Amino acid sequence: TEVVMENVTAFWEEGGTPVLKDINFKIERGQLLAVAGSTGAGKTSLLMMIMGELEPSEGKIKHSGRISFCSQFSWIMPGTIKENIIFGVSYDEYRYRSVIKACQLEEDISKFAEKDNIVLGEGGITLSGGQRARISLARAVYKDADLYLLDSPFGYLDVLTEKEIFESCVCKLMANKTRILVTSKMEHLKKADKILILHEGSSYFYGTFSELQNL
Ligand SMILES: Nc1ccn([C@H]2C[C@H](O)[C@@H](COP(=O)(O)OP(=O)(O)OP(=O)(O)O)O2)c(=O)n1
Ligand SMILES: [Mg+2]
């Protein structure tokens, strides 16, 4: 067992309304959990609890080891595209190239004369939203970790590109890794080992895509 929430309730403000209410799930090592729900349902807050930024008022949580987190808000720091993806982690060509490919960034990088040394975040190149999202995803996926928290990482991508990168990066490249992906898309829920749909803090549904189809 890699991540567990048991009867978890939590509050961002003392005596407010709970941001998560009696949440339950388990992820085995190497599995994919899809977390879905409308805006404000508590999805990012659930990731924050796993990262220790939010403590439960009721219930138990299990998770061990290092986390790589991909924010739903993409970001770039001043430096090359290679520096932004590596982001202080030791460099390996094969690992770097495999992440770039899985995130469809090889196409973008090949078009620049400076290739992977193109400078970002310093007033020169202004990236598209989708480029910034794929760079942010690549940064999180390059980091070696026991648990990957990917919070709606496909911002600004058209539905086919999102599908292709979900398959190449989240399903294939990351096949052996424990993953929590905040996402609403049907194919992602169908491919996940477990799905958790949140609504206003509560568990709207928890189970498999097949179980939901059975209903
Ligand atoms: N430091 C914080 C963070 C969030 N909230 C509130 C805001 C929401 O009403 C509720 C859930 O916030 P989330 O960020 O967890 O919501 P989602 O991630 O599910 O929404 P979205 O899809 O818009 O990202 O908690 C708060 O009071 N204090
Ligand atoms: Mg969020």
Swiss-Prot record:
Question: How changing residue 198 to S affects the protein?
Answer: In CF; impaired maturation of glycan chains
Tissue-specificity statement = Expressed in the respiratory airway, including bronchial epithelium, and in the female reproductive tract, including oviduct (at protein level). Detected in pancreatic intercalated ducts in the exocrine tissue, on epithelial cells in intralobular striated ducts in sublingual salivary glands, on apical membranes of crypt cells throughout the small and large intestine, and on the reabsorptive duct in eccrine sweat glands. Detected on the equatorial segment of the sperm head (at protein level). Detected in nasal and bronchial superficial epithelium.
| Result of altering residue 138 to T | In CF; impaired maturation of glycan chains
Annotated phenotype, changing residue 155 to A: In CBAVD; uncertain significance
Q: Give every ABC transporter domain span.
A: 16-215
Residues that coordinate or bind ATP 1: 12, 37-44, 72
The secretion signal range is: none
Q: What is the effect of changing residue 141 to I?
A: In CBAVD and CF; uncertain significance; found in cis of the IVS8 TG11-T5 allele, which affects exon 9 splicing; no effect on protein maturation, trafficking to the cell membrane, nor on channel activity
Q: Where in the cell is it found?
A: Apical cell membrane; Early endosome membrane; Cell membrane; Recycling endosome membrane
Q: Altering residue 180 to F: what's the impact?
A: In CF; impaired maturation of glycan chains
The record's similarity note reads: Belongs to the ABC transporter superfamily. ABCC family. CFTR transporter (TC 3.A.1.202) subfamily.
Q: Please state the pathology the record ties to this protein.
A: Cystic fibrosis: A common generalized disorder of the exocrine glands which impairs clearance of secretions in a variety of organs. It is characterized by the triad of chronic bronchopulmonary disease (with recurrent respiratory infections), pancreatic insufficiency (which leads to malabsorption and growth retardation) and elevated sweat electrolytes. It is the most common genetic disease in Caucasians, with a prevalence of about 1 in 2'000 live births. Inheritance is autosomal recessive. Congenital bilateral absence of the vas deferens: An autosomal recessive disease characterized by vas deferens aplasia resulting in azoospermia and male infertility. CBAVD may occur in isolation or as a manifestation of cystic fibrosis.
Role of this protein: Epithelial ion channel that plays an important role in the regulation of epithelial ion and water transport and fluid homeostasis. Mediates the transport of chloride ions across the cell membrane. Possesses an intrinsic ATPase activity and utilizes ATP to gate its channel; the passive flow of anions through the channel is gated by cycles of ATP binding and hydrolysis by the ATP-binding domains. The ion channel is also permeable to HCO(3)(-); selectivity depends on the extracellular chloride concentration. In vitro, mediates ATP-dependent glutathione flux.
What is the protein's given name?
Cystic fibrosis transmembrane conductance regulator
Recorded source organism is Homo sapiens
Name of the gene encoding the protein in the UniProt record: CFTR
Q: Which residues of the full protein are shown?
A: 390 to 636 of 1480
